[PDB]
Enzyme design. Structure first.
Site, PDB file in Angstrom:
ATOM      1  N   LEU A   1      10.211  -2.813  -0.162  1.00  0.00           N
ATOM      2  CA  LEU A   1      10.206  -2.699  -1.786  1.00  0.00           C
ATOM      3  C   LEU A   1      11.877  -2.049  -2.084  1.00  0.00           C
ATOM      4  O   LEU A   1      12.367  -2.379  -2.977  1.00  0.00           O
ATOM      5  CB  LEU A   1       9.179  -1.769  -1.941  1.00  0.00           C
ATOM      6  CG  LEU A   1       7.605  -2.349  -2.246  1.00  0.00           C
ATOM      7  CD1 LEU A   1       6.729  -1.471  -2.248  1.00  0.00           C
ATOM      8  CD2 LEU A   1       7.583  -3.409  -3.031  1.00  0.00           C
TER       9      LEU A   1
ATOM     10  N   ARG B   1       7.805  -0.707  14.799  1.00  0.00           N
ATOM     11  CA  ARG B   1       6.903  -1.870  14.944  1.00  0.00           C
ATOM     12  C   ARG B   1       7.084  -2.596  15.894  1.00  0.00           C
ATOM     13  O   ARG B   1       5.986  -3.406  16.322  1.00  0.00           O
ATOM     14  CB  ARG B   1       6.551  -2.520  13.218  1.00  0.00           C
ATOM     15  CG  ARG B   1       6.336  -1.648  12.239  1.00  0.00           C
ATOM     16  CD  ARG B   1       5.974  -2.364  10.956  1.00  0.00           C
ATOM     17  NE  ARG B   1       5.447  -1.238   9.833  1.00  0.00           N
ATOM     18  CZ  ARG B   1       5.660  -1.456   8.754  1.00  0.00           C
ATOM     19  NH1 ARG B   1       6.246  -2.519   8.508  1.00  0.00           N
ATOM     20  NH2 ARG B   1       5.375  -0.872   7.935  1.00  0.00           N
TER      21      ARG B   1
ATOM     22  N   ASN C   1       5.509 -24.125  -9.756  1.00  0.00           N
ATOM     23  CA  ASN C   1       5.935 -24.065  -8.565  1.00  0.00           C
ATOM     24  C   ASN C   1       7.317 -24.806  -8.256  1.00  0.00           C
ATOM     25  O   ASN C   1       7.554 -26.028  -8.559  1.00  0.00           O
ATOM     26  CB  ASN C   1       4.954 -24.922  -7.703  1.00  0.00           C
ATOM     27  CG  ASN C   1       5.287 -24.921  -6.072  1.00  0.00           C
ATOM     28  OD1 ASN C   1       6.537 -24.335  -5.603  1.00  0.00           O
ATOM     29  ND2 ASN C   1       4.328 -25.263  -5.307  1.00  0.00           N
TER      30      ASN C   1
ATOM     31  N   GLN D   1       0.704  -1.127  -0.125  1.00  0.00           N
ATOM     32  CA  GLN D   1      -0.026  -0.027   0.029  1.00  0.00           C
ATOM     33  C   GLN D   1       0.788   1.286   0.099  1.00  0.00           C
ATOM     34  O   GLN D   1       0.870   2.089  -0.937  1.00  0.00           O
ATOM     35  CB  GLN D   1      -0.983   0.021   1.138  1.00  0.00           C
ATOM     36  CG  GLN D   1      -1.272  -1.326   1.262  1.00  0.00           C
ATOM     37  CD  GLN D   1      -2.392  -1.570   2.494  1.00  0.00           C
ATOM     38  OE1 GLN D   1      -2.763  -0.654   3.450  1.00  0.00           O
ATOM     39  NE2 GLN D   1      -3.346  -2.574   2.624  1.00  0.00           N
TER      40      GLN D   1
ATOM     41  N   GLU E   1       0.619   1.829   7.262  1.00  0.00           N
ATOM     42  CA  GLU E   1       1.048   2.676   8.510  1.00  0.00           C
ATOM     43  C   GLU E   1       1.115   3.937   7.921  1.00  0.00           C
ATOM     44  O   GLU E   1       0.810   4.942   8.695  1.00  0.00           O
ATOM     45  CB  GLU E   1       2.564   2.290   9.039  1.00  0.00           C
ATOM     46  CG  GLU E   1       3.054   2.397  10.072  1.00  0.00           C
ATOM     47  CD  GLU E   1       4.143   1.937  10.791  1.00  0.00           C
ATOM     48  OE1 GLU E   1       4.261   1.051  11.966  1.00  0.00           O
ATOM     49  OE2 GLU E   1       5.409   2.056  10.165  1.00  0.00           O
TER      50      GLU E   1
HETATM   51  C1  LIG Z   1      -0.051  -6.113   2.514  1.00  0.00           C
HETATM   52  C2  LIG Z   1       1.359  -5.846   2.356  1.00  0.00           C
HETATM   53  C3  LIG Z   1       1.800  -4.432   2.508  1.00  0.00           C
HETATM   54  C4  LIG Z   1       3.128  -4.098   2.144  1.00  0.00           C
HETATM   55  N1  LIG Z   1       3.343  -2.766   1.603  1.00  0.00           N
HETATM   56  C5  LIG Z   1       4.628  -2.405   1.629  1.00  0.00           C
HETATM   57  C6  LIG Z   1       4.968  -1.019   1.203  1.00  0.00           C
HETATM   58  O1  LIG Z   1       4.021  -0.266   0.773  1.00  0.00           O
HETATM   59  N2  LIG Z   1       6.320  -0.677   0.973  1.00  0.00           N
HETATM   60  C7  LIG Z   1       7.276  -1.756   1.086  1.00  0.00           C
HETATM   61  O2  LIG Z   1       8.344  -1.380   0.910  1.00  0.00           O
HETATM   62  N3  LIG Z   1       7.070  -3.186   1.465  1.00  0.00           N
HETATM   63  C8  LIG Z   1       5.479  -3.364   1.691  1.00  0.00           C
HETATM   64  N4  LIG Z   1       5.458  -4.565   1.969  1.00  0.00           N
HETATM   65  C9  LIG Z   1       6.401  -5.557   2.099  1.00  0.00           C
HETATM   66  C10 LIG Z   1       6.931  -5.741   0.871  1.00  0.00           C
HETATM   67  O3  LIG Z   1       5.727  -5.599   0.167  1.00  0.00           O
HETATM   68  C11 LIG Z   1       7.415  -7.108   0.385  1.00  0.00           C
HETATM   69  O4  LIG Z   1       8.694  -7.649   1.311  1.00  0.00           O
HETATM   70  C12 LIG Z   1       7.819  -7.219  -0.877  1.00  0.00           C
HETATM   71  O5  LIG Z   1       6.758  -7.024  -1.781  1.00  0.00           O
HETATM   72  C13 LIG Z   1       8.544  -8.642  -1.250  1.00  0.00           C
HETATM   73  O6  LIG Z   1       8.835  -8.850  -2.647  1.00  0.00           O
HETATM   74  P1  LIG Z   1       9.355  -9.885  -3.323  1.00  0.00           P
HETATM   75  O7  LIG Z   1       9.770  -9.736  -4.850  1.00  0.00           O
HETATM   76  O8  LIG Z   1      10.690  -9.858  -2.910  1.00  0.00           O
HETATM   77  O9  LIG Z   1       8.502 -11.225  -3.171  1.00  0.00           O
HETATM   78  P2  LIG Z   1       7.040 -11.225  -3.667  1.00  0.00           P
HETATM   79  O10 LIG Z   1       6.424  -9.904  -4.257  1.00  0.00           O
HETATM   80  O11 LIG Z   1       6.146 -11.752  -2.325  1.00  0.00           O
HETATM   81  O12 LIG Z   1       6.877 -12.296  -4.727  1.00  0.00           O
HETATM   82  C14 LIG Z   1       7.350 -13.640  -4.516  1.00  0.00           C
HETATM   83  C15 LIG Z   1       7.100 -14.311  -5.894  1.00  0.00           C
HETATM   84  O13 LIG Z   1       7.744 -15.369  -5.615  1.00  0.00           O
HETATM   85  C16 LIG Z   1       7.208 -16.398  -6.254  1.00  0.00           C
HETATM   86  N5  LIG Z   1       7.348 -17.825  -5.687  1.00  0.00           N
HETATM   87  C17 LIG Z   1       7.356 -18.061  -4.188  1.00  0.00           C
HETATM   88  N6  LIG Z   1       7.442 -19.241  -4.033  1.00  0.00           N
HETATM   89  C18 LIG Z   1       7.641 -19.763  -5.227  1.00  0.00           C
HETATM   90  C19 LIG Z   1       7.995 -21.117  -5.652  1.00  0.00           C
HETATM   91  N7  LIG Z   1       8.136 -21.921  -4.561  1.00  0.00           N
HETATM   92  N8  LIG Z   1       8.316 -21.389  -6.814  1.00  0.00           N
HETATM   93  C20 LIG Z   1       7.945 -20.528  -7.928  1.00  0.00           C
HETATM   94  N9  LIG Z   1       7.838 -19.172  -7.406  1.00  0.00           N
HETATM   95  C21 LIG Z   1       7.689 -18.895  -6.325  1.00  0.00           C
HETATM   96  C22 LIG Z   1       5.866 -16.303  -6.022  1.00  0.00           C
HETATM   97  O14 LIG Z   1       5.154 -16.642  -7.105  1.00  0.00           O
HETATM   98  C23 LIG Z   1       5.901 -14.439  -6.347  1.00  0.00           C
HETATM   99  O15 LIG Z   1       5.601 -14.529  -7.593  1.00  0.00           O
HETATM  100  C24 LIG Z   1       3.976  -4.933   1.991  1.00  0.00           C
HETATM  101  C25 LIG Z   1       3.702  -6.343   2.356  1.00  0.00           C
HETATM  102  C26 LIG Z   1       2.459  -6.744   2.508  1.00  0.00           C
HETATM  103  C27 LIG Z   1       2.156  -7.981   2.696  1.00  0.00           C
END
Ligand SMILES: Cc1cc2nc3c(=O)[nH]c(=O)nc-3n(C[C@H](O)[C@H](O)[C@H](O)COP(=O)(O)OP(=O)(O)OC[C@H]3O[C@@H](n4cnc5c(N)ncnc54)[C@H](O)[C@@H]3O)c2cc1C
Ligand code: NA
Length: 529
Positions: free
Chosen positions: A388, A286, A157, A46, A256
């Site tokens: 992010l 937090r 997966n 968000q 937040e």
């Molecule tokens: C409700 C919410 C709000 C948030 N808002 C913010 C914000 O405003 N600002 C901020 O900095 N952070 C925010 N965060 C924290 C931050 O959002 C996340 O840590 C960040 O999105 C993580 O991104 P990522 O690219 O590392 O993984 P993700 O965006 O979670 O994606 C992981 C990817 O990995 C893939 N994957 C997972 N396991 C497998 C598997 N076993 N095999 C193949 N593919 C797989 C999933 O399919 C997905 O595509 C928020 C988090 C939440 C939950």
């Protein structure tokens, strides 16, 4: 062959997609995604991304804020490093199509409007209304789909990574692909690569309550471990202090940012409780807030607490929290006129797979960036909007290191196919369902917001029972999602607990009644396979 590429990116959220773009002009890339290509935490962020844009603000504050919010064990090079490349990375994102809320009005001309969340001490959070995620994900998604050198494989997966010394290849231990359950055709197919990148997200789903999509099962943490990587700091899981306590609140988070723009934290009786806990009130970090809310629920025996922005102009609110406004309304709640019930729920995995500046792990060819990782940036407690942020900086540095390495890279060899085991058992399947619930429940009670050695014992013993129990009843069972996910949640739960039993102190998100004090010399908790 089956599937081949230069760099295989496991995960398609901010970390992966963004890394994928940087690599695309010159590499063959395949991004996997375990559910639809956009399902993932990122799509749901968000409040937005922290970076430094205001003349007034400075990289220094952003660091120091981070070092403080991290309770003393943030690794400094890591924090500066990253403090020192946002906009550029933030800018990069923008140069990709992302549209952050423009102001209109310093008192001369237009800019990027900026919020604040706790621990920040200057305004530097770029956002898009109260749903940054959708704008970032949606965009990186669209770019990656319209790019010839990146192939997106949805509903795919990964099960485990292929390590050369494990399939009788010779040379040092290095990753050379992954076996992937192809959800649609119900087999495990093989994917060959010269570089594998874990970008799978985090693990808060090991906890009964979370702000997360159902994907956040810690898969990449587990994969990496099974492959030899050390992992760290997994006792530091953040429970976002304000998630919606409503029966139809599937799992929803009130940003937040709300507090950032004036929102209040109230007791069921109207009083503001934070100041009983921390001068920083509504905007303390937090671990401290979540703890206070938890404390007050217990002392009062209350289902919950409240988040109130009523004192504010209906209009401000509706223009700055559209999405949350539209959606509390369907649940017959008026952010515009009433305090919302909220509870602390599992939100982000501060720790994870150890990695250096270029996202490299302990195993050659294997990288990890994003929440699945451990860089040192979040020490014992993330600061809002650095998440992010970490995703982007590491997609960059990693692109750089890989790019430089690809030209000398070994040639893509043939690999053994996965041994599809094939037994079934409609009933035992159900049981795999009981266990998932079981896990999530006891971790909440035994590796939660307040902790004790004795509860950590209980938790490990139950996880041990679960793993023994799993070898025995589900080693021959035919692959499936739930079983894949359960092996992973259980694996990760072990690392969490073991990491938590090592810390004889109370710091950041780890609070245990048996060591209320701080050691004078701390650091990360490290586990090696
Ligand atoms: C409700 C919410 C709000 C948030 N808002 C913010 C914000 O405003 N600002 C901020 O900095 N952070 C925010 N965060 C924290 C931050 O959002 C996340 O840590 C960040 O999105 C993580 O991104 P990522 O690219 O590392 O993984 P993700 O965006 O979670 O994606 C992981 C990817 O990995 C893939 N994957 C997972 N396991 C497998 C598997 N076993 N095999 C193949 N593919 C797989 C999933 O399919 C997905 O595509 C928020 C988090 C939440 C939950
Ligand atoms: Na992490």
């Amino acid at each position: 062959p089956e599937h081949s590429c230069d760099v295989l990116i496991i995960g398609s959220g901010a970390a992966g997609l963004s890394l994928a773009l940087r690599l695309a002009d010159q590499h063959q890339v395949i991004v996997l995604s375990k559910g639809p290509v956009t399902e993932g935490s990122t799509f749901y962020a968000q409040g937005g991304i922290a970076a430094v844009f205001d003349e007034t603000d400075s990289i220094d504050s952003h660091v120091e804020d981070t070092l403080i919010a991290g309770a003393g064990i943030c690794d400094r090079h890591a924090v500066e490093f990253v403090a020192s490349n946002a906009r550029s990375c933030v800018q990069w994102l923008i140069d990709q199509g992302v549209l952050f809320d423009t102001h209109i009005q310093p008192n001369g001309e237009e800019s990027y409007h900026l919020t604040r969340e706790g621990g920040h001490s200057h305004r530097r959070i770029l956002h898009a209304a109260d749903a940054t995620g959708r704008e970032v994900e949606t965009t990186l998604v669209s770019k990656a789909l319209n790019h010839p050198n990146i192939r997106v494989l949805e509903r795919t997966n990964a099960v485990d990574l292929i390590v050369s010394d494990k399939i009788g290849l010779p040379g040092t231990r290095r990753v050379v692909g992954a076996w992937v359950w192809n959800r649609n055709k119900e087999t495990v197919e093989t994917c060959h690569a010269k570089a594998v990148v874990l970008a799978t997200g985090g693990a808060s789903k090991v906890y009964q309550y979370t702000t997360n999509p159902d994907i956040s099962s810690g898969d990449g943490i587990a994969m990496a471990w099974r492959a030899g990587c050390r992992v760290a700091n997994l006792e530091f899981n953040q429970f976002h202090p304000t998630a919606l306590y409503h029966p139809q609140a599937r799992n929803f988070l009130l940003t937040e940012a709300l507090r950032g723009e004036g929102a209040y934290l109230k007791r069921p009786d109207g009083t503001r409780f934070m100041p009983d806990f921390d001068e920083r009130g509504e905007l303390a970090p937090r671990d401290i807030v979540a703890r206070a809310i938890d404390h007050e629920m217990k002392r009062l025996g209350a289902d919950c607490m409240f988040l109130d922005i009523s004192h504010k102009p209906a209009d401000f609110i509706r223009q700055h929290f559209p999405m949350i406004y539209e959606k509390l309304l369907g649940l017959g709640i008026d952010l515009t006129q009433e305090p919302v019930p909220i509870v602390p729920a599992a939100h982000y995995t501060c720790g994870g797979v150890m990695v250096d500046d270029h996202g490299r792990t302990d195993v050659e060819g294997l990288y990890a960036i994003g929440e699945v990782s451990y860089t040192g940036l979040h020490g014992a407690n993330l600061m809002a909007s650095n998440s992010l942020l970490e995703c982007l900086v590491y997609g960059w540095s990693a692109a750089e290191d890989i790019t430089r390495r690809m030209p000398y890279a070994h040639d893509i060899s043939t690999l053994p196919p996965w041994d599809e085991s094939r037994v079934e058992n409609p009933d035992e399947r159900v049981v795999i369902q009981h266990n998932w619930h079981e896990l999530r429940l006891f971790m909440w009670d035994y590796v939660g917001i307040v902790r004790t050695t004795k509860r950590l014992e209980r938790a490990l013993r139950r996880i041990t029972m679960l793993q023994q129990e799993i070898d025995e009843y589900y080693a021959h069972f035919r692959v499936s999602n739930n079983l894949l996910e359960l092996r992973n949640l259980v694996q990760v739960a072990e690392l969490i607990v073991r990491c938590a039993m090592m810390r004889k102190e109370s710091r950041g998100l780890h609070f245990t009644l048996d060591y209320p004090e701080l050691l004078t010399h701390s650091g990360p908790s490290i586990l090696s396979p």
